[PDB]
From a paper:
The experimental data show that the M66I mutation leads to an >84,000-fold reduction in the activity of GS-6207, a picomolar HIV-1 capsid-targeting antiviral, while the same mutation leads to only a 68-fold reduction in the activity of the newly designed antiviral ZW-1261 and a 83-fold loss in the activity of PF74. As a result, although the EC50 of ZW-1261 against WT HIV-1 is higher than that of GS-6207, the EC50 values of these compounds against HIV-1 M66I are comparable. The molecular mechanism of resistance imparted by M66I and its differential effects on the binding of these antivirals is not immediately obvious from the crystal structures of the CA−compound complexes. The results of the FEP calculations estimate that the binding affinities of GS-6207, ZW-1261, and PF74 are reduced by 367-fold, 43-fold, and 58-fold, respectively, which correlates well with the experimentally determined EC50 values. We then compared the MD structures of the M66I CA mutant in complex with GS-6207, ZW-1261, and PF74. While the I66 side chain in the M66I−ZW-1261 or PF74 complexes essentially maintained the same rotamer state as that of the one in the apo protein in Figure 3, in the M66I−GS-6207 complex the I66 side chain moved to a new, higher-energy rotamer, with the γ2 carbon and δ carbon switching positions. The global free energy minimum (χ1≈160°) in the apo M66I CA coincides with the rotamer observed in the M66I−ZW-1261 and M66I−PF74 complexes. In contrast, the corresponding conformational changes are largely absent in the I66 of the M66I−ZW-1261 and M66I−PF74 complexes, and in the WT−GS-6207. By using a formula that decomposes the absolute binding free energy into contributions from two receptor conformational states, we show that the protein side chain reorganization plays a major role in the M66I resistance to GS-6207.
In recent years, HIV-1 CA has emerged as a major drug target for antiviral therapeutic development. CA not only acts as the building block of the HIV-1 capsid core formation but also interacts with several host factors. Small molecule agents with different chemotypes have been developed in recent years to disrupt the CA biological functions in the virus replication cycle.
Numbering used by the authors:
A (entry chain A), B (entry chain A), C (entry chain A), D (entry chain A), E (entry chain A), F (entry chain A): 1 to 221
Write the structure that this text describes.
């Protein structure tokens, strides 16, 4: 990450050993479960592209996922370049250049070059931009590596309602969808796929009911 | 959380790796037991809304609970908006806007926007306000996920009094109630549901007696 | 705890994650054994009332003990109020009020209000005062939860003297008593309840003898 | 690593105990798997040659690897000396000398001498240069210690496609090759060595297809 | 321990959670083995008397040892008072008093009073003085709790010489003695109590020989 | 270690709890294996003699080794004194004295005296000098405690060449020798003691060959 010198030359801050270790263990224990993402995100706050690649480099295994991820990164980088075309040729001595897609992703850019973009008036936050791309990729991986669909989540004859909701919302968090879409799945599937006894109860509460209410309503049954 | 630059531009402070890890393990080990709340609260002191969502995002499992929690968050946000209506249209260049319910909760607001509200003369402490909402929600979850009622806590024939009190006060901490209500449960249930031998002793101490006294009184028996 | 800004506005310092964790594990492993107290005390140095309640809130289980503790806290708070009566009515705009028993204990006082009292010329150290109350309560709990009395500590026929002393001093540390009282128990019980063979030796050293001497004297036997 | 004094004499910063420990455990758990390198690299950011040797010295076992590594280091040092020949004889009192290959590698140079080179206007980043050499060596070790070739990675009759890709990309990361070469292996081997049923599917997607697409295409089969 | 404010009012520094934990675990794992002392000493560098008592308070068990330790502390405190008699009566408003034996040990002195003594021109280092007393006591405990005497350390018929020396020097470190005395035990016992075969070899090296030499000399045998 | 005050009086920095713990565990797990030394060295960077003795004091067991180590320390101290003779008698009030061998080793010198030497214009780096002595001693211990000689390292009929090299270089690192000597052992033993099949291959590569080459050459066989 970045921080200010005594003299106020802007200076890079090495990633902590325990930030590194955190990220690795996360991955070893949790694979690509949706919570992985807010964690990757939280451990990389302030990161430059170099820092972000470091972090990604430290994952061993899961190399299929990692490759999809680069594909995702290339698609965004291409798109960046299309919306921000580079004026080429000579470069004005000492002054900074405009980052291409590759420069953002860290392939074609030095650390020194990166800090330069990030700490500018006005600042070009290349680390933030790269992180969006990564997280977009991380989402795709999560969706792909999810064993079941929201459509196949039905409540068991003997399943307490709390647990059915737990699997519905767990699965739903892993899905490909806008908020409009998730609402629609909630609104359509959740009660439609409850078990008979509790479904009757819930038809009868009508569609203003809170979860807290639905759950309490189906507690005794 | 937030802290002051060398130049005194107010700057965000990334959440520690061990704060993150703390919170996760808490949840894995203790579920929603009442002590979870003072811990969530203690690990989020100084937090912005982003920080608070991060923390919440890092919980995997318990997704029913998490959804009730959002419901709680929406109810408070709505109520906020009702008591603080936004003047809309154009916004004065450079100056900050008035946070809506959604802006407080972090849905419709940037980190930069948040720090801005929090560090103002006078400061609009959006992080503190969001935390109230969350904790209100966390309480509801705790109550709901409590296996037994204060009414069913009776002292065993062979139960030492210390243990009965331990279950009474454990259960009571999980209950829905003001202080007026808890006092009333204490004052009515605690002795009424002791076991025969010790109940006699306690009728005989009368209602000024301390716990220390009650416990000592029923020690030998 | 508290610390000074760059600008020297006095500012609150969030409790460390590892301070929190320390305290919890202590309690899980050691219950209310006398060493718990110097540890609670050491982990709460610099604490405000809020900090102290946080810490207390994080204990799950032991809720009987916790309730005795509040009782203890109320008794001290009442007594505080009796010796420091509050002048009521309006309050002078901007200036601080005199803390009541409840304000010290954190029930009726904000963090901001607390720091205000603590960092005053001259400082009203409300955190220190609350901590006395707590520790007084913690002592009562320790005494109460001690399985055996100093009177029942006798040396075994086959018990090395070092071990008997170990149980005597362990038990004695858990007892209700001034220093005058502990001395008297030492001076009366320790040798009176040694086993026959070693008692003879010790009668014969006379009452100026050090522990080091007594122990060495009864080493071979 | 290096940091600035109160007086701004540039001063060495001892390696953290947990940086040390990190590196050792990495090696004990992961041997020379490709992820080792980004980790060595991340734990040595800011390092001087001394720091880098320290770190290398702390590995026990793997001494064959360590010797190849020195060989690699000598080859680079020789080459350095060939492209940067030293003007010899007397040295100007007080002023710094030009580092030879050996001085970069830390054999013939003091810490004080190193900091001197690193913190110069303009700075001679000897630590960065040595690190390139090491990492070049570390790569060679990784390749050598890889049990299988990219050529022998075939998909099992019963192997899900995700797993085959996982072994292909794991093995490919361990290989000797430029990016041109890896692309060529990908482009030639990956589909050519899938199992029959899925190969047919993939011939039929044609060579623009993403991994995400290929994987999804072969999901049901 | 102690440190300087922004304003340079000298201020107390709370003991770290991990310093606390360190000390406790030491004791749980190692009892009173001689290495305990350099560790207690290393974890208490900079300590005030309060800090030192805290640390001592956190030991549970070993209460016989703890009592001998206080006895030791009283003997030193008495002696202090004899060599530094207090002028009594009124005290000059605001100025500091001369610490008695009890004030050094922390019984009769406040933290504020202690920092005052320690940070004076010239400084009265009460923490250093108390630590001497403690360590003197800790030594006595170590000696006492040592299972065997230097006199009973003989080399086994089948014991490698390295191991015999290991037990000799382990035992010798636990003994009551000046350096003059330890030298004499070394010089008299070490070879006199080696086993026959190796004793002959060693008589023959004569008394200038190093350990390194003695050990090498008896290697093959 | 040492650091600068706010006022720039040079001040001692207590050794971290985790530096202490690091060193102890190292020793418990790894005994005197050659990697111990770079670790002792890395954990003691910046150390004064006191700090270095502390660290050494914390080792329990291995007391034969520890005694050889002191012997080594005395030999160096004697030699120091011979090359730097002390002018004796009175000492100039306030000014510092010239450290003897004993003063360097910490026997006859205070911490305050040590910092004084270390932070002088020009600085007498007594901590660095003592550390050389120790490490010289630590080397001797390592050599002595090495179970096998470089001469007895032969490659097994069934031993992969990588493993034979691993034992050769492991053993060689533990040996008594200059670089001239190690080269000679390498150059003479390594191939001379390979197993028949691989020896033939290697005779045939001739003596310019790299390890990387030798190892690859004997891979299939
Ligand atoms: C911005 N934001 C979030 O990041 C919230 C923070 C939060 C998590 C858990 C409980 C409460 C809040 N996170 C999410 O919406 C992501 C999420 C977590 N679990 C899910 C399950 C299904 C789904 O579609 C999304 C999620 C958010 C905050 C408040 C609300 Cl009301 C909604 C979202
Ligand atoms: C403000 N405050 C609290 O947060 C106290 C702090 C505290 C916890 C444990 C022992 C002593 C004190 N916490 C509580 O009242 C919450 C609580 C903990 N256990 C309970 C059990 C039942 C219940 O209704 C509430 C609680 C508080 C402080 C002092 C008193 Cl006397 C009462 C409350
Ligand atoms: C102020 N103070 C304490 O806090 C001492 C510090 C200390 C603990 C252990 C060994 C030596 C010293 N602590 C105590 O007196 C509490 C205590 C610990 N074990 C006990 C066992 C019985 C008892 O009645 C009290 C204690 C103290 C210091 C010196 C002396 Cl001589 C006496 C007390
Ligand atoms: C500079 N850089 C890297 O260091 C990337 C960072 C990264 C790792 C994992 C997923 C995404 C990105 N790392 C690599 O290319 C090394 C690598 C990791 N796994 C591999 C597998 C095969 C291979 O030939 C190389 C690698 C990089 C960044 C973006 C792209 Cl698109 C490509 C490379
Ligand atoms: C001041 N000082 C010490 O504290 C040395 C430091 C040190 C420990 C271990 C190996 C080398 C050095 N420590 C000791 O003398 C205490 C000691 C450790 N093991 C022992 C075994 C027997 C004994 O009588 C004393 C000790 C010291 C330093 C150098 C020498 Cl040569 C002698 C002592
Ligand atoms: C100064 N220096 C060292 O401290 C190197 C650093 C280093 C360790 C491991 C791999 C590469 C480099 N360390 C050593 O030479 C000590 C050593 C480690 N393993 C050995 C095995 C045998 C031996 O005789 C010495 C060593 C060094 C640096 C570069 C070279 Cl090429 C040689 C030495």
């Amino acid at each position: 990450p970045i921080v200010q010198n005594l003299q106020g030359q802007m200076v890079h801050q090495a990633i902590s050993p325990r930030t590194l270790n955190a990220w690795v263990k996360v991955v070893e224990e949790k694979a690509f479960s949706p919570e992985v993402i807010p964690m990757f995100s939280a451990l990389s706050e302030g990161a430059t592209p170099q820092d972000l690649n470091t972090m990604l480099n430290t994952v061993g295994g899961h190399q299929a996922a990692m490759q999809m991820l680069k594909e995702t990164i290339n698609e965004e980088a291409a798109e960046w370049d299309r919306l921000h075309p580079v004026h080429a040729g000579p470069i004005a001595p000492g002054q900074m250049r405009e980052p291409r897609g590759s420069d953002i992703a860290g392939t074609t850019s030095t650390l020194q070059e990166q800090i330069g973009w990030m700490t500018h008036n006005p600042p070009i936050p290349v680390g933030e931009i790269y992180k969006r791309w990564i997280i977009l990729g991380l989402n795709k991986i999560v969706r792909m590596y999810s064993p079941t669909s929201i459509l196949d989540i039905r409540q068991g004859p003997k399943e307490p309602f709390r647990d059915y909701v737990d699997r519905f919302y767990k699965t739903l968090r892993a899905e490909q969808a806008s908020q409009e879409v998730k609402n629609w799945m909630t609104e359509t599937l959740l009660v439609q796929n409850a078990n008979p006894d509790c479904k009757t109860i819930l038809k009868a509460l009508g569609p203003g009911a809170t979860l807290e209410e639905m759950m309490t309503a189906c507690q005794g049954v």
